[PDB]
Amino acid sequence: PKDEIFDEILGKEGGYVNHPDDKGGPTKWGITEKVARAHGYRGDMRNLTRGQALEILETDYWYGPRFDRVAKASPDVAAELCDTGVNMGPSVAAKMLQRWLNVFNQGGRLYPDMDTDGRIGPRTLNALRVYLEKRGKDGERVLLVALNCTQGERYLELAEKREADESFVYGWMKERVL
Amino acid sequence: KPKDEIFDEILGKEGGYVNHPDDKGGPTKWGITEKVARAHGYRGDMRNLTRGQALEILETDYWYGPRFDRVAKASPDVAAELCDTGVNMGPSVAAKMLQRWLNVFNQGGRLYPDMDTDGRIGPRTLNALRVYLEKRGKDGERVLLVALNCTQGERYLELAEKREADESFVYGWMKERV
């Protein structure tokens, strides 16, 4: 599901565009020179390969945030976090999970409230496993709907500020109907 | 989900006059406080409030007053969602969510200009709903209901975080939408 997410971001073609050294720099495979260099790329951006671009994406939006560990407990939750993180930021996505796990812990019966720090840590992963163990697959389904509600309200607010296209948010809701 | 079932579930089969000492509301029957009953022109004893007077008061505050009945002429399903939201959070909270979504989905003002997100359903809000439903069709209505559910779910999160909503309610509310 993550592979599909990144394979859709990395189009069939590099699309090398040379923006100002300051304003983004040269970009290929959606990677700016600045981001590439910060991930140890030293070549010309005209010769950046899809593979190293995918490594940068998997690092920033899957492994760095530790969505791969979430996937160990719930492939579906991790996929939603990953898709959320590429559009809004991985820490925004991680905070949504933490917020929901705190409200659904039954006044701290299942586990104590965690920090909503937006980092997937051992306490976040333990809370997710206890939640999934106590509430079972119905729990997992409830959590996914809840995450979708916080994603959609953030797309609303992004669209109000013009950081997201109307068509994009209409299409995202359309994908979630019956 | 329909309006009659929403009110028929709030009004039980039994009045249950409980005489709170004014502070914690009460005298209350059929979920109606004396304060609300008298503010609706009921002058009898609160012990003798009829179910029918109580239904008239609910219909007044949570269906006609907010103009959800006029919404229902355009979309029975959107009106029923607003009515359910309004009884839990306030009808103007519900009405404002509709205005925000109709503004994002107006295609940069192509279908109709941005309306005031004042939380009051006026002739321009109902005109915008009818144009939206005529341009985007039944798929439009389904999309708008998903979007309204996202803003509802995220407001329940906020309410639960402030302790203004029971965790059980919000889990229950997600589960019924699984």
Numbering used by the authors:
A (entry chain A): 11 to 188
B (entry chain B): 10 to 187
The paper states:
We have previously shown that TtsA’s muramidase activity exhibits exquisite specificity for L-D cross-linked PG.
Sen1395, a close TtsA homolog from S. Enteritidis, is unable to complement a ∆ttsA S. Typhi mutant for typhoid toxin translocation because it exhibits different substrate specificity. To gain insight into the mechanisms of TtsA substrate specificity, we solved the atomic structure of Sen1395 to 1.9 Å resolution with an Rwork of 0.20 and an Rfree of 0.24. The crystals belonged to the P1 space group and contained two monomers per asymmetric unit. The positions of the conserved catalytic residues in both enzymes overlap reasonably well, which is consistent with the observation that the catalytic domain of TtsA can be replaced with the catalytic domain of Sen1395 and retain full function. Notably, while the surface of the substrate-binding groove in TtsA is lined by largely uncharged amino acids (Ile116, Gln120, Gln164, Asn166), the equivalent surface in Sen1395 is occupied by several charged amino acids (Asp117, Arg121, Glu165, Asp167). We found that, unlike TtsA, when expressed in S. Typhi Sen1395 was not enriched at the poles and showed a uniformed distribution around the bacterial surface. Taken together, these results indicate that Sen1395 and TtsA exhibit different PG specificity and that the substrate specificity determinants of both TtsA and Sen1395 are contained within their carboxy-terminal half.
